[PDB]
Design a protein around this ligand. Structure first.
Ligand SMILES: Nc1ccn([C@H]2C[C@H](O)[C@@H](COP(=O)(O)C(F)(F)P(=O)(O)OP(=O)(O)O)O2)c(=O)n1
Ligand SMILES: [Cl-]
Ligand SMILES: [Cl-]
Ligand SMILES: [Mg+2]
Ligand SMILES: [Mg+2]
Ligand code: NA
Ligand code: NA
Length: 326
DNA sequence: CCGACGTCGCATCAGC
DNA sequence: GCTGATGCGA
DNA sequence: GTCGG
């Protein structure tokens, strides 16, 4: 909140470049500049003071000067007026509707919530669910509710097979007082980088969760990644809890640390970390960290026995999950 | 300057 | 059917 | 949009 005004501006610009301009790299650029400024311990008084921080170039320095003086940004004042941008931005807020689909819908005349509801036939499964829970999905999840959700998921997974280990990651693992959704990392001794000794490992858990009516909808589902909707049960007369987004990722047990590092995030932290890895000559994914031999081809997975080992390989002092919120 | 920018799973599609 | 590329998402 | 070689 120290430099909230500036970070909010940069974020709005990031969203515009991603949704409207479909320029994913410009989006990352703003996201980064925004991230760095957010951690800066001082109240920025000029664009020059900001350009010092890495990720902030000249263009963003000027905008900051504009924002400090005027308290707003003309570039954004305009984007806000443009109907197509306003429309594309709104549509993208529906889960399942990205920049491409949004721009398309706008071409066909579909640019509002009402339009979406009277044209459900033009939406695929995912998009139809996003429309359905449009309201609920924008609501944050209190940590208290996250704890109830954790209890249900872990206790149900245990009932399916005691060898399953379920770990809630994401912002929750980073200590956040509220989350956008629930991200669950799952492991079972019967699924390793060596072999899949048992099929449907992910399926059965999803199955069980649907059985107790915790998971209510499915946006997508494969052998290792599930993306759906869930809801905490309510008591007598008690109003129902909002529907929430839940993601479950099945990861080879022996590659748990690379997995938990990946799933804990944040997204920007992971991107910055992976970038640093490359600068140091390593490549990291949710399964392992590997070296980059001259040519470029990734080498063999290095040994990993802790999240810390990963950090060491790239000469980065370890950072608690709570300090990985960039 | 200038081509890179983290990495990958699922859904959907085009070309065969 | 498959593979390879695009869209959307983690 | 930024930047390092
Ligand atoms: N582009 C991305 C997106 C995600 N992630 C990893 C790292 C993320 O921490 C993790 C979860 O994805 P999430 O989409 O639930 C998230 F990011 F929003 P979370 O941090 O959980 O915040 P919230 O509470 O709002 O959900 O996937 C990643 O590596 N790259
Ligand atoms: Cl771009
Ligand atoms: Cl790998
Ligand atoms: Mg999350
Ligand atoms: Mg998630
Ligand atoms: Na800079
Ligand atoms: Na969307």
């Amino acid at each position: 909140t120290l430099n909230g005004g500036i970070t909010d501006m940069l974020t709005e610009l990031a969203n515009f470049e991603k949704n409207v301009s479909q320029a994913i790299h410009k989006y990352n650029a703003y996201r980064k500049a925004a991230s760095v400024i957010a951690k800066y311990p001082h109240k920025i008084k000029s664009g020059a003071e900001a350009k010092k921080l890495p990720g902030v170039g000249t263009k963003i320095a000027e905008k900051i000067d504009e924002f400090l003086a005027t308290g707003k940004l003309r570039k954004l004042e305009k984007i806000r007026q443009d109907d197509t941008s306003s429309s594309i931005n709104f549509l993208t807020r529906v889960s399942g509707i990205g920049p491409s689909a949004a721009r398309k819908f706008v071409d066909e005349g579909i640019k509002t919530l009402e339009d979406l509801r009277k044209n459900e036939d033009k939406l695929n499964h995912h998009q139809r669910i996003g429309l359905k829970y449009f309201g609920d999905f924008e609501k944050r999840i209190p940590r208290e509710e996250m704890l109830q959700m954790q209890d249900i998921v872990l206790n149900e997974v245990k009932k399916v097979d005691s060898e399953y280990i379920a770990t809630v990651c994401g912002s929750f693992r980073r200590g956040a007082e509220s989350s956008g959704d629930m991200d669950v990392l799952l492991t079972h001794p019967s699924f390793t980088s060596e072999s899949t000794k048992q099929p449907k490992l992910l399926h059965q858990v999803v199955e069980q969760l649907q059985k107790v009516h915790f998971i209510t909808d499915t946006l997508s589902k494969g052998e290792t990644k599930f993306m759906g909707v869930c809801q905490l049960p309510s008591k007598n007369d008690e109003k129902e809890y909002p529907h929430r987004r839940i993601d479950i990722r099945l990861i080879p047990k022996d590659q748990y640390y690379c997995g938990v590092l990946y799933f804990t995030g944040s997204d920007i932290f992971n991107k910055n970390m992976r970038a640093h890895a490359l600068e140091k000559g390593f490549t990291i994914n949710e399964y392992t960290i590997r070296p980059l031999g001259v040519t470029g081809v990734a080498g063999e997975p290095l040994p990993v026995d802790s999240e810390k080992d990963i950090f060491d390989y790239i000469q980065w002092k370890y950072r608690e999950p709570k300090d990985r919120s960039e």
